[PDB]
Amino acid sequence: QIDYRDVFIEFLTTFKGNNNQNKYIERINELVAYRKKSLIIEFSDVLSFNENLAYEIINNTKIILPILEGALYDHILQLDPTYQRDIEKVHVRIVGIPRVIELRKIRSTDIGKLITIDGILVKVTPVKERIYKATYKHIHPDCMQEFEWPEDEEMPEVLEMPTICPKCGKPGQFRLIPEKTKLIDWQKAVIQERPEEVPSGQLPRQLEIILEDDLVDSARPGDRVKVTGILDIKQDSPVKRGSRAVFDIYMKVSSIEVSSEEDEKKIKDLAKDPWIRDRIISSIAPSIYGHWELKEALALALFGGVPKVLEDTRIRGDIHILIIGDPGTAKSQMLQFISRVAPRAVYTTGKGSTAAGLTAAVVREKGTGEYYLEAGALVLADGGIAVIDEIDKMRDEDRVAIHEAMEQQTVSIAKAGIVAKLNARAAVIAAGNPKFGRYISERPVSDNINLPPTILSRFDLIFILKDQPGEQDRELANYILDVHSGKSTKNIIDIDTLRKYIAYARKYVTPKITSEAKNLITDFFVEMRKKSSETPDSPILITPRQLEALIRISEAYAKMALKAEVTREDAERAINIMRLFLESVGVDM
Amino acid sequence: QIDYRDVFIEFLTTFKGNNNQNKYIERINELVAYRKKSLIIEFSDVLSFNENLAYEIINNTKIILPILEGALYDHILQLDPTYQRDIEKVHVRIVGIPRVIELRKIRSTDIGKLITIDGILVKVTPVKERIYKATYKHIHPDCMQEFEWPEDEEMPEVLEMPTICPKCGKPGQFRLIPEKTKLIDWQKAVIQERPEEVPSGQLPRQLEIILEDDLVDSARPGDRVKVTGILDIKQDSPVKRGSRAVFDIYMKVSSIEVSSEEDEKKIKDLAKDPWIRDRIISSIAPSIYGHWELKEALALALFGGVPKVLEDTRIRGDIHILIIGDPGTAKSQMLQFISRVAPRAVYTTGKGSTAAGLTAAVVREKGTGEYYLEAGALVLADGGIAVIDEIDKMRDEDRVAIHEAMEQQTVSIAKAGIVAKLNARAAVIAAGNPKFGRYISERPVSDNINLPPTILSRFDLIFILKDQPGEQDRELANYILDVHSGKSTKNIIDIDTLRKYIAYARKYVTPKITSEAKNLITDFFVEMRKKSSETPDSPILITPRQLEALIRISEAYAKMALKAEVTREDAERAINIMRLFLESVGVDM
DNA sequence: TTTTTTTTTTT
Ligand SMILES: [Mg+2]
Ligand SMILES: [Mg+2]
Ligand SMILES: [Zn+2]
Ligand SMILES: [Zn+2]
């Protein structure tokens, strides 16, 4: 009823942040400075400020958003007149809607209401253009008149042509004029419900969402998103009714978020502890007893090294880990934990994957019969982590497809007239069993591993797990029963905090190698080669890749403590962990 | 509103270039010599000469080009009246527009503006004809009238037939008259964004462009081009509404550049150095330590020999290189560098390619129902370099598809009623691993290589790389760490100018064989054949192909120094490099 | 039916 434009403007200029620093005033000039033409607000803050305004947004969304858009636009023009003639419309987006509904629980009662859905992005289409105001010319020898067809109204989702010329009142031919037509960016995406939300024995459901204007290209497939907007029915093929008054539903996205200053203080506070490295390792798979050297290795792969890009070549910065062990050694359980804690990870099984599905697949589009590309698991994991369980179960002729993606971090396809190259910069963690299921100490190491030396040299670290019963059985049994009894280990960083810590470290820390670290690494690498040549029978080869493994591991150790330099202490830790890897495969040092 | 035709004419007639030769009057001078009806003007030159004139082209391109082009036509007629009755309209193409937009960043605000896009050409269609002014006959026994349908306007993108006869005002049926219709050449192409600008975890995007009149057949697939023109929305089936008022965008090309005299003297200056060959070799893969003999071999393949075309046959002039080595010997890094410095190169892997994708594929169009050919990797690489990494991972029944393309440089297809023969004159560089991952010195060369003798004989040079940990580890380790520390080797030819040097040499240099070079090559071949008879178990056969390899290598060495003939020094170098090849495969002379 | 790359059952 009443106008809240005065309230909205006053709220923007008078709201107080956590430190009462007016967390909203400094967003306005940032909008003006960068001409971002999109401003977001929090529903909790609006409700905390004025209860009446929050309800009107949450209920009368379709008749108040343009009103607040006009009021905000006027406030921008007075603040900076130069904003005019560059941006003709500014959008305000509301987040944190209390109306959250599961994807499977949407009913007809929720149509037309501002709701929020949490799911997984699966498909994204290229950006296109949608007409919201057309212009036609009446092709009738008497008219030759141009007019905007939808009068005082946006063009509906169905493209409708005028039947009677408004300028002359007669029918005839109408020709669209693209020059005078107004367009808006338009993208279509598909969202899927989370695996933990799917009911027993059923496939996950999917919903179609539409992103327009500045919301296009807001996320990539495989992301976890929270989308807010209005639901509506979909009219796709109305040319022929064919009975079937049944319709699907789709969502007009108003605000989207993927997956902060307070968190940064928490992250930096953690790094102040001298024993942060040991504290982080203790937080990796808290439900698994022992395997301290494995948890340390897995922690390094989460942080990785520093990729180097030069004018003529680039160097891999990711760390690859291979684990071989007897059944029941908690290999799969540890790998599942990595998927949860990594900011971006893809979990695959060796038997349930193919060569085309891992890198890229060439498929024939049924509508046109033309071949095109589909991204594989490694491509979708670019910048993240790829987990391959049961690597020994894959066919050897099929496993070689990942050799290029594991060192050059690229995928090359030359099939059916398609030549393409794709980036696959991801870290690979793989697990498997020995050749005879269990490790046989009588036989050498070569026949136990049963893998070609080419793939073995690609892995920075290799650990062989032996399940040897001994005095430690009682400790293991007590630990497992405590887990089943609900007792939880304390003094460990929670998974949510740990994920934020890793994401921050991988984005703002780039350690550099000092002179002291160079001498230690060089001496140790020379020592490997001399020792390796003494026993030319092991299946492990000390190639120059091993030298680069030491550099990557050293940078990861420094990056774990948010250090900008690789001191001698990190080099010693990198050398020490490499020693345990060599002792595992029976290479003494 | 000021008349710019006078400004244009004085700009063309009076302009000073960097060389001080009035660059812009020679182009129009050659315009009438060859009747090319197209003039190229740089945006930097017009802006410097007249800032106001340059701006008017940028923002008023729609209604300034016909006036600007019309003014140029009158000037040409004054220069030579003979241009009349040969060319009706002359097009002016503007390049160097500062408005450069990435392919993924195009939004609605860029529609109708002159922009420039850099990308890769992937698809070209055959040249067709487009109607811009039709002629119709009213089939109604009283009319028998001819009229150009679109009055004072060209035919739009969508063909439209008149509904009311302009000659009588009555409806009816109208018949097109092809002989009185005005046509224009039309071609469609697809541009793909470069792999550098593709975001993480996303597939590359594509844009459709239209070439008309003299711009047709101005490029070939795989080229890197810059296109300037106007964006517009694409209409395909406007008659069928089918809801979904969402359109795709295409581009009307106004000028195209495919990726000068100052380079000629720069290249000539480089060739004057007596040690130019060493400088070129030292500039191949600067980030790789050692492997001097492999760097020399890769340099030869970039330049290549001299193809011979005779009345009854032709002789291959390309050089093929095969490298077999232990894992971690930087084989893939060098191949990556070659794919960047080569003016035209295609990079493929053994596992990610098929027989059809390498040579040619037969694809059926579901619309018409007929079969047609699709160019493979080797066909697209004609006149350039083809890189096939991990060649040993190819299926043997699939690898044999390149036997004829490597020697006869042709692709023969007899499939689905299609018999064809395509040129595949491309050099092949391949790498792979021995049978057991690493070379075993305790076993003969026969079972280490694991490749048929038919394909081995087709390679001019074969190098077996052994990773022997010796006393050079410290030097190798220090070099690698220096690379990781940002240190760069100095006194090398950078990749950009090195690419220009190779392109110039392969185009203007055709060395000849002298009498003294013939004697050295003949004597060496006799000894090579005699020595091979000692060991017949080796899978390396000295065939007459090896004699022609010596000729090709000798020509390549001369081509490096831009020499016009092959002297005894070039023959000696060819013998020396051939000797190292034989020693590696176990033939000692 | 036909060539092609893909997952699938069945020749
Ligand atoms: Mg398991
Ligand atoms: Mg390699
Ligand atoms: Zn009208
Ligand atoms: Zn008529």
PDB file of C-alpha atoms in Angstrom, chain A residues 113-299:
ATOM      1  CA  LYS A 113       6.168 -17.380  -4.836  1.00  0.00           C
ATOM      2  CA  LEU A 114       9.748 -16.356  -4.077  1.00  0.00           C
ATOM      3  CA  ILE A 115      11.463 -19.576  -2.981  1.00  0.00           C
ATOM      4  CA  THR A 116      14.993 -20.970  -2.720  1.00  0.00           C
ATOM      5  CA  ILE A 117      16.390 -24.315  -3.895  1.00  0.00           C
ATOM      6  CA  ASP A 118      19.756 -25.914  -3.114  1.00  0.00           C
ATOM      7  CA  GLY A 119      21.166 -28.377  -5.612  1.00  0.00           C
ATOM      8  CA  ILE A 120      23.932 -29.270  -8.044  1.00  0.00           C
ATOM      9  CA  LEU A 121      24.486 -27.654 -11.437  1.00  0.00           C
ATOM     10  CA  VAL A 122      24.723 -30.215 -14.249  1.00  0.00           C
ATOM     11  CA  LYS A 123      24.135 -28.495 -17.607  1.00  0.00           C
ATOM     12  CA  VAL A 124      24.751 -24.967 -18.896  1.00  0.00           C
ATOM     13  CA  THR A 125      23.888 -23.651 -22.361  1.00  0.00           C
ATOM     14  CA  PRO A 126      25.715 -20.939 -24.321  1.00  0.00           C
ATOM     15  CA  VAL A 127      24.539 -17.379 -23.773  1.00  0.00           C
ATOM     16  CA  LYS A 128      21.768 -16.296 -26.142  1.00  0.00           C
ATOM     17  CA  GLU A 129      19.498 -13.276 -26.635  1.00  0.00           C
ATOM     18  CA  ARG A 130      15.802 -12.922 -25.820  1.00  0.00           C
ATOM     19  CA  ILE A 131      13.475 -10.283 -27.247  1.00  0.00           C
ATOM     20  CA  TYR A 132      11.483  -8.352 -24.658  1.00  0.00           C
ATOM     21  CA  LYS A 133      10.314  -5.528 -26.956  1.00  0.00           C
ATOM     22  CA  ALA A 134      10.051  -5.998 -30.721  1.00  0.00           C
ATOM     23  CA  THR A 135       9.587  -3.642 -33.661  1.00  0.00           C
ATOM     24  CA  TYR A 136       7.583  -4.475 -36.779  1.00  0.00           C
ATOM     25  CA  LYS A 137       6.935  -2.895 -40.167  1.00  0.00           C
ATOM     26  CA  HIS A 138       3.544  -3.498 -41.775  1.00  0.00           C
ATOM     27  CA  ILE A 139       4.261  -4.737 -45.312  1.00  0.00           C
ATOM     28  CA  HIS A 140       1.114  -3.406 -46.954  1.00  0.00           C
ATOM     29  CA  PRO A 141       1.502  -0.986 -49.889  1.00  0.00           C
ATOM     30  CA  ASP A 142      -0.257   1.739 -47.890  1.00  0.00           C
ATOM     31  CA  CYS A 143       1.344   1.462 -44.428  1.00  0.00           C
ATOM     32  CA  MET A 144       5.172   1.253 -44.425  1.00  0.00           C
ATOM     33  CA  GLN A 145       4.895   2.058 -40.719  1.00  0.00           C
ATOM     34  CA  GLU A 146       7.124   0.968 -37.838  1.00  0.00           C
ATOM     35  CA  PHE A 147       5.836   0.319 -34.329  1.00  0.00           C
ATOM     36  CA  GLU A 148       6.746  -1.504 -31.135  1.00  0.00           C
ATOM     37  CA  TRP A 149       4.386  -4.475 -31.010  1.00  0.00           C
ATOM     38  CA  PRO A 150       3.829  -5.261 -27.301  1.00  0.00           C
ATOM     39  CA  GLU A 151       2.302  -2.000 -26.114  1.00  0.00           C
ATOM     40  CA  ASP A 152       3.106  -1.024 -22.502  1.00  0.00           C
ATOM     41  CA  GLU A 153       4.016  -4.657 -21.833  1.00  0.00           C
ATOM     42  CA  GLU A 154       7.016  -6.952 -22.088  1.00  0.00           C
ATOM     43  CA  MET A 155       7.090  -9.496 -24.883  1.00  0.00           C
ATOM     44  CA  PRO A 156       5.780 -12.798 -23.462  1.00  0.00           C
ATOM     45  CA  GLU A 157       7.740 -16.034 -23.529  1.00  0.00           C
ATOM     46  CA  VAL A 158       5.825 -16.947 -26.699  1.00  0.00           C
ATOM     47  CA  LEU A 159       6.794 -14.878 -29.731  1.00  0.00           C
ATOM     48  CA  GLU A 160       3.520 -13.319 -30.894  1.00  0.00           C
ATOM     49  CA  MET A 161       3.151 -11.273 -34.094  1.00  0.00           C
ATOM     50  CA  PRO A 162       0.570  -8.487 -34.458  1.00  0.00           C
ATOM     51  CA  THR A 163      -2.562  -9.490 -36.357  1.00  0.00           C
ATOM     52  CA  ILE A 164      -4.032  -6.008 -36.920  1.00  0.00           C
ATOM     53  CA  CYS A 165      -1.712  -3.095 -37.630  1.00  0.00           C
ATOM     54  CA  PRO A 166      -2.243  -0.502 -34.864  1.00  0.00           C
ATOM     55  CA  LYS A 167      -1.169   2.318 -37.183  1.00  0.00           C
ATOM     56  CA  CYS A 168      -3.794   1.531 -39.845  1.00  0.00           C
ATOM     57  CA  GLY A 169      -6.164  -1.099 -38.429  1.00  0.00           C
ATOM     58  CA  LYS A 170      -5.614  -3.559 -41.277  1.00  0.00           C
ATOM     59  CA  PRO A 171      -4.020  -7.026 -41.344  1.00  0.00           C
ATOM     60  CA  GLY A 172      -1.274  -8.109 -43.695  1.00  0.00           C
ATOM     61  CA  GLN A 173       2.443  -8.835 -43.553  1.00  0.00           C
ATOM     62  CA  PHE A 174       4.677  -7.664 -40.707  1.00  0.00           C
ATOM     63  CA  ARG A 175       8.476  -7.677 -40.907  1.00  0.00           C
ATOM     64  CA  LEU A 176      10.652  -7.650 -37.801  1.00  0.00           C
ATOM     65  CA  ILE A 177      13.272  -4.906 -37.570  1.00  0.00           C
ATOM     66  CA  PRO A 178      16.290  -6.247 -35.636  1.00  0.00           C
ATOM     67  CA  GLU A 179      17.935  -2.816 -35.424  1.00  0.00           C
ATOM     68  CA  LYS A 180      15.099  -1.317 -33.362  1.00  0.00           C
ATOM     69  CA  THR A 181      14.473  -4.507 -31.366  1.00  0.00           C
ATOM     70  CA  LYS A 182      15.510  -4.608 -27.706  1.00  0.00           C
ATOM     71  CA  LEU A 183      17.284  -7.710 -26.410  1.00  0.00           C
ATOM     72  CA  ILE A 184      18.396  -9.180 -23.091  1.00  0.00           C
ATOM     73  CA  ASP A 185      20.949 -11.865 -22.275  1.00  0.00           C
ATOM     74  CA  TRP A 186      19.486 -15.314 -21.698  1.00  0.00           C
ATOM     75  CA  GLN A 187      20.993 -18.576 -20.455  1.00  0.00           C
ATOM     76  CA  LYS A 188      19.445 -21.925 -19.543  1.00  0.00           C
ATOM     77  CA  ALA A 189      20.820 -24.246 -16.865  1.00  0.00           C
ATOM     78  CA  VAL A 190      19.725 -27.488 -15.215  1.00  0.00           C
ATOM     79  CA  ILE A 191      19.955 -28.149 -11.475  1.00  0.00           C
ATOM     80  CA  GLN A 192      19.880 -31.540  -9.753  1.00  0.00           C
ATOM     81  CA  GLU A 193      19.028 -32.417  -6.169  1.00  0.00           C
ATOM     82  CA  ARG A 194      21.805 -33.392  -3.786  1.00  0.00           C
ATOM     83  CA  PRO A 195      22.665 -37.099  -3.408  1.00  0.00           C
ATOM     84  CA  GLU A 196      21.957 -36.971   0.333  1.00  0.00           C
ATOM     85  CA  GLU A 197      18.435 -35.706  -0.447  1.00  0.00           C
ATOM     86  CA  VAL A 198      17.391 -38.418  -2.924  1.00  0.00           C
ATOM     87  CA  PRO A 199      14.931 -40.930  -1.414  1.00  0.00           C
ATOM     88  CA  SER A 200      15.800 -44.606  -1.286  1.00  0.00           C
ATOM     89  CA  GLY A 201      15.710 -46.514  -4.555  1.00  0.00           C
ATOM     90  CA  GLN A 202      14.973 -43.542  -6.820  1.00  0.00           C
ATOM     91  CA  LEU A 203      16.866 -41.458  -9.346  1.00  0.00           C
ATOM     92  CA  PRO A 204      17.574 -37.787  -8.574  1.00  0.00           C
ATOM     93  CA  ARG A 205      15.165 -35.192  -9.916  1.00  0.00           C
ATOM     94  CA  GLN A 206      16.066 -32.203 -12.073  1.00  0.00           C
ATOM     95  CA  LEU A 207      14.787 -28.655 -12.483  1.00  0.00           C
ATOM     96  CA  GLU A 208      15.243 -26.152 -15.306  1.00  0.00           C
ATOM     97  CA  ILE A 209      16.347 -22.628 -14.382  1.00  0.00           C
ATOM     98  CA  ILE A 210      16.802 -19.472 -16.444  1.00  0.00           C
ATOM     99  CA  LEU A 211      19.550 -16.894 -15.907  1.00  0.00           C
ATOM    100  CA  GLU A 212      19.211 -13.473 -17.519  1.00  0.00           C
ATOM    101  CA  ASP A 213      21.265 -10.275 -17.839  1.00  0.00           C
ATOM    102  CA  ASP A 214      24.243 -10.168 -15.422  1.00  0.00           C
ATOM    103  CA  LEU A 215      23.469 -13.610 -13.962  1.00  0.00           C
ATOM    104  CA  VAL A 216      24.790 -15.414 -17.055  1.00  0.00           C
ATOM    105  CA  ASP A 217      28.000 -17.443 -16.674  1.00  0.00           C
ATOM    106  CA  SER A 218      27.672 -17.268 -12.890  1.00  0.00           C
ATOM    107  CA  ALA A 219      28.755 -20.881 -12.305  1.00  0.00           C
ATOM    108  CA  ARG A 220      30.266 -23.944 -13.950  1.00  0.00           C
ATOM    109  CA  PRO A 221      28.824 -27.475 -14.157  1.00  0.00           C
ATOM    110  CA  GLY A 222      29.366 -29.600 -11.072  1.00  0.00           C
ATOM    111  CA  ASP A 223      29.049 -26.665  -8.672  1.00  0.00           C
ATOM    112  CA  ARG A 224      26.860 -26.544  -5.572  1.00  0.00           C
ATOM    113  CA  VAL A 225      24.513 -23.567  -5.790  1.00  0.00           C
ATOM    114  CA  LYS A 226      21.599 -21.922  -3.999  1.00  0.00           C
ATOM    115  CA  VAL A 227      19.117 -20.342  -6.417  1.00  0.00           C
ATOM    116  CA  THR A 228      16.309 -17.932  -5.520  1.00  0.00           C
ATOM    117  CA  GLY A 229      13.454 -16.857  -7.758  1.00  0.00           C
ATOM    118  CA  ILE A 230       9.902 -17.405  -8.953  1.00  0.00           C
ATOM    119  CA  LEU A 231       8.570 -20.713 -10.247  1.00  0.00           C
ATOM    120  CA  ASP A 232       6.510 -20.830 -13.428  1.00  0.00           C
ATOM    121  CA  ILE A 233       5.125 -23.332 -15.914  1.00  0.00           C
ATOM    122  CA  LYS A 234       7.022 -23.981 -19.141  1.00  0.00           C
ATOM    123  CA  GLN A 235       5.460 -23.440 -22.575  1.00  0.00           C
ATOM    124  CA  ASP A 236       7.792 -25.069 -25.105  1.00  0.00           C
ATOM    125  CA  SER A 237       5.838 -26.399 -28.122  1.00  0.00           C
ATOM    126  CA  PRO A 238       2.475 -24.594 -28.347  1.00  0.00           C
ATOM    127  CA  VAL A 239       2.155 -24.848 -32.150  1.00  0.00           C
ATOM    128  CA  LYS A 240       0.097 -28.053 -31.860  1.00  0.00           C
ATOM    129  CA  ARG A 241      -1.792 -28.775 -28.647  1.00  0.00           C
ATOM    130  CA  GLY A 242      -2.049 -32.552 -29.049  1.00  0.00           C
ATOM    131  CA  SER A 243      -4.259 -32.681 -25.930  1.00  0.00           C
ATOM    132  CA  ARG A 244      -1.902 -33.022 -22.910  1.00  0.00           C
ATOM    133  CA  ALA A 245      -2.833 -29.993 -20.831  1.00  0.00           C
ATOM    134  CA  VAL A 246       0.003 -31.080 -18.527  1.00  0.00           C
ATOM    135  CA  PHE A 247       3.013 -28.773 -18.208  1.00  0.00           C
ATOM    136  CA  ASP A 248       6.477 -28.810 -16.688  1.00  0.00           C
ATOM    137  CA  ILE A 249       7.831 -26.110 -14.377  1.00  0.00           C
ATOM    138  CA  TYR A 250      10.893 -23.873 -14.474  1.00  0.00           C
ATOM    139  CA  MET A 251      12.463 -21.195 -12.295  1.00  0.00           C
ATOM    140  CA  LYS A 252      13.333 -17.584 -13.113  1.00  0.00           C
ATOM    141  CA  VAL A 253      16.523 -17.033 -11.128  1.00  0.00           C
ATOM    142  CA  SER A 254      16.753 -13.772  -9.182  1.00  0.00           C
ATOM    143  CA  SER A 255      19.949 -14.454  -7.210  1.00  0.00           C
ATOM    144  CA  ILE A 256      22.488 -17.287  -7.237  1.00  0.00           C
ATOM    145  CA  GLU A 257      25.312 -18.104  -4.829  1.00  0.00           C
ATOM    146  CA  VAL A 258      28.019 -20.765  -5.057  1.00  0.00           C
ATOM    147  CA  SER A 259      28.895 -23.031  -2.118  1.00  0.00           C
ATOM    148  CA  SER A 260      33.648 -13.949   4.466  1.00  0.00           C
ATOM    149  CA  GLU A 261      35.797 -11.374   6.245  1.00  0.00           C
ATOM    150  CA  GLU A 262      35.086 -13.068   9.578  1.00  0.00           C
ATOM    151  CA  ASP A 263      36.272 -16.357   8.078  1.00  0.00           C
ATOM    152  CA  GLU A 264      39.508 -14.695   6.956  1.00  0.00           C
ATOM    153  CA  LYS A 265      40.284 -13.650  10.531  1.00  0.00           C
ATOM    154  CA  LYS A 266      39.589 -17.205  11.695  1.00  0.00           C
ATOM    155  CA  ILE A 267      41.863 -18.637   8.996  1.00  0.00           C
ATOM    156  CA  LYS A 268      44.711 -16.243   9.778  1.00  0.00           C
ATOM    157  CA  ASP A 269      44.316 -16.933  13.502  1.00  0.00           C
ATOM    158  CA  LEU A 270      44.838 -20.652  12.879  1.00  0.00           C
ATOM    159  CA  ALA A 271      48.075 -20.069  10.956  1.00  0.00           C
ATOM    160  CA  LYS A 272      49.603 -18.298  13.968  1.00  0.00           C
ATOM    161  CA  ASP A 273      49.986 -21.590  15.842  1.00  0.00           C
ATOM    162  CA  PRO A 274      53.495 -23.054  15.367  1.00  0.00           C
ATOM    163  CA  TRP A 275      52.033 -26.587  15.300  1.00  0.00           C
ATOM    164  CA  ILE A 276      49.425 -25.816  12.638  1.00  0.00           C
ATOM    165  CA  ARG A 277      50.938 -28.437  10.320  1.00  0.00           C
ATOM    166  CA  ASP A 278      50.562 -31.209  12.895  1.00  0.00           C
ATOM    167  CA  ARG A 279      47.098 -29.942  13.828  1.00  0.00           C
ATOM    168  CA  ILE A 280      45.979 -30.048  10.185  1.00  0.00           C
ATOM    169  CA  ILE A 281      47.249 -33.606   9.692  1.00  0.00           C
ATOM    170  CA  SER A 282      45.421 -34.805  12.807  1.00  0.00           C
ATOM    171  CA  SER A 283      42.186 -33.504  11.249  1.00  0.00           C
ATOM    172  CA  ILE A 284      42.485 -35.700   8.132  1.00  0.00           C
ATOM    173  CA  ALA A 285      40.125 -38.687   8.439  1.00  0.00           C
ATOM    174  CA  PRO A 286      39.669 -38.533  12.234  1.00  0.00           C
ATOM    175  CA  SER A 287      37.776 -41.848  12.204  1.00  0.00           C
ATOM    176  CA  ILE A 288      40.788 -43.807  10.885  1.00  0.00           C
ATOM    177  CA  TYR A 289      43.325 -45.150  13.372  1.00  0.00           C
ATOM    178  CA  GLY A 290      46.988 -44.908  12.470  1.00  0.00           C
ATOM    179  CA  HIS A 291      48.288 -44.361   8.939  1.00  0.00           C
ATOM    180  CA  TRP A 292      50.007 -41.140   9.978  1.00  0.00           C
ATOM    181  CA  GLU A 293      52.303 -41.096   6.945  1.00  0.00           C
ATOM    182  CA  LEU A 294      49.296 -41.547   4.649  1.00  0.00           C
ATOM    183  CA  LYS A 295      47.367 -38.672   6.223  1.00  0.00           C
ATOM    184  CA  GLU A 296      50.407 -36.424   5.820  1.00  0.00           C
ATOM    185  CA  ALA A 297      50.706 -37.351   2.140  1.00  0.00           C
ATOM    186  CA  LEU A 298      46.998 -36.756   1.528  1.00  0.00           C
ATOM    187  CA  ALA A 299      47.214 -33.345   3.205  1.00  0.00           C
TER     188      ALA A 299
END
